[PDB]
């Protein structure tokens, strides 16, 4: 068992998502002009998102749908699809990290959008309203 | 500013340390025989620790020594020493990541020990008792 209690796995996955969101949202703000675009900071943010996208899945242990969590129970009865959506987030995030090595803003925006689709798509199905 | 409020910066750096501890402790348990050693998991842990070690510094914004934190105000009056300690944690994490590419248990333990000193060394000076 990777966690002592269900409440440690919830906090772990919640912390992971939160930190990913902080780094993802900064890339969104730079791409929308809410804050100046910076190639080096954007690349750091993309690296952080790629790495942090590999953390939360470990936290979705059996029985951790009870408690102070927004995870829906259907996650575990459809864990194969949930797992697939998490792998595709990782893949998309690795692609955004690659796009940050290029100077093509089309590419950055496109791979960013694909990653944003992954956050959104999973929340729509597997996160409480 | 990267954070709207000081409390968001505290929560960010605390989450990063929290995820780091979970990953660092799993490596400790494997190196101490508290749980089966797994080279593939161990390497993932080492990768996770190195990536996570690059995150918390951003959360140490000025004025965030007040709030729901265990950080000492001293961090800000000795910020370059604190920063140097964070970089050395990154250095040691990178060496632990490299060591994880080998099967030399002694080198694994030494590398793990070197990271452990960094955690403890900084806590001893800059985290409340
Ligand atoms: C399923 C395959 C997901 C992917 C892809 C993404 N997220 Fe998500 N997120 C998911 C769940 C099931 C939960 C609830 C966790 C819980 O135990 O309550 C979340 C939660 C978040 C949160 C809130 C975390 C918190 O502080 O409580 C955030 C900010 C968040 N998720 C962001 C986020 C982003 C930015 C993503 C794309 C980079 C993303 N998630 C993908 C499920 C899934
Ligand atoms: C200084 C350069 C540090 C290094 C190196 C490490 N840690 Fe630390 N940690 C530091 C501070 C100043 C704080 C308090 C932050 C706050 O605002 O309260 C912490 C906190 C932690 C915690 C508690 C996190 C929480 O849930 O509130 C943990 C579990 C932790 N740190 C673990 C940890 C590990 C495993 C480290 C080595 C890999 C490590 N820290 C290094 C300062 C510094």
Chain length of chain B: 129
A80 SS3 class: helix
Please, are residues A62 and A88 in contact by the beta-carbon 8 Å criterion?
Answer: no
Residues 6+ apart with CB under 8 A from A33: none
Please, are residues B42 and A42 in contact by the beta-carbon 8 Å criterion?
Answer: no
The Cα B36–Cα B21 span in angstroms is: 19
Cα A71 to ligand 1 centroid, rounded to whole Å: 9
CA of A51 to nearest chain B CA: how many angstroms apart? Answer: 6
* Token pair recorded at residue A13: 């996955």
Query: Which residue(s) pair with A127 in the sheet?
Result: A71
Q: A79 — contact with chain B (CB < 8 Å)?
A: no
Please, are residues A83 and A5 in contact by the beta-carbon 8 Å criterion?
Answer: no
Taken in order of first residue, the domains within chain A and their CATH numbers are 6-126 (1.20.120.10)
| Window 1-30 of A, Cβ < 8 Å to B | 2, 8, 11-12, 15-16, 18-19, 22, 26
The Cα B92–Cα B81 span in angstroms is: 16
Chain length of chain A: 129
Please, are residues A61 and A6 in contact by the beta-carbon 8 Å criterion?
Answer: yes
The Cα A127–Cα A74 span in angstroms is: 10
Nearest ligand to the C-alpha of residue B122?
2
A64 SS3 class: coil
Query: Which residue(s) pair with B71 in the sheet?
Result: B127
Method by which the model was determined: X-ray
| A to B CB pairs, distance under 8 Å | 38
In chain B, alpha helices (H): 6-31, 39-52, 74-77, 79-99, 105-126
């Amino acid at each position: 068992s990777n966690f002592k209690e269900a409440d440690d796995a919830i906090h772990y996955r919640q912390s992971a998502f939160s930190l990913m969101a902080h780094n993802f949202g900064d890339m969104g703000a730079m791409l929308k002009g809410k804050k100046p675009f910076d190639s080096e900071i954007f690349a750091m943010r993309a690296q952080n998102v790629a790495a942090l996208s590999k953390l939360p899945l470990e936290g979705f242990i059996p029985g951790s749908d009870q408690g102070e969590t927004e995870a829906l129970a259907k996650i575990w009865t459809e864990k194969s699809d949930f797992d697939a959506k998490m792998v595709t987030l990782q893949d998309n995030a690795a692609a955004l990290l690659l796009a940050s090595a290029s100077d093509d803003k089309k590419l950055l925006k496109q791979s960013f959008m694909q990653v944003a689709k992954s956050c959104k798509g999973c929340h729509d199905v597997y996160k409480k309203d």
